Amino acid sequence: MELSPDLISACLALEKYLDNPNALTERELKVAYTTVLQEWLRLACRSDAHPELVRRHLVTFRAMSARLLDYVVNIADSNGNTALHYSVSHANFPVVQQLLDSGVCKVDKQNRAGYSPIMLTALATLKTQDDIETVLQLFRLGNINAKASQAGQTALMLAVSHGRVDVVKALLACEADVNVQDDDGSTALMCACEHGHKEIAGLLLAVPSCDISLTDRDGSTALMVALDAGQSEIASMLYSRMNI
């Protein structure tokens, strides 16, 4: 366990550049940026990334410049992915925790594909209460109702379509808006109907403001989507909501 000298050496260079863009030559800037991006992503973004070692670098970055901490914590590869995107995507939540605690994370920033680290939680299977709390903290630092650039989907819709009940529970605990519609006019409840996630439809219908009369671009309500998908248990829960 030791601070990457290659990383620190290139961060000292970038600190001068962030103070004054004329302080590094063209060659020196290209080299330092390339090294920081590479080493920072070696250190933080791997599957086995060690949270204590992450914390130590974050303290050394801070003690160099508060502007360097922000710049490094939010540095992004050619696909727009940051340490937060990758460590959420690998479900390495002890590292996510360490990144969140830096104070400088951008939990709503979308990669080139159009998704924020909040949205990347949708495919995570949460294992422990520690992980759940980290996720809740992540959610509460940004806009849980934001829409991805591709199809206008939210975190809730993504999580609902992938059957990740615990991510759905954490979203609703942070008061996620269940009535948001994607570019097709689809709601989260309609995702549950398509994919037949009976329990998840339950969780959504338990949200009192859940609007079951919303329609997509073809005029389908959730009930229509549920009937066309042969999901009679979900359809049945919708009958009770329509007072039958």
């Binding site: 995507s89 594909a113 199809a151 819709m157 570019d183 309609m190 398509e194």
Partner: peptide, 15 residues
Amino acid sequence: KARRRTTTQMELLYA
């Protein structure tokens, strides 16, 4: 329709 798609880990990360 997007509500019927199953996106993967790598589709969320890369495009």
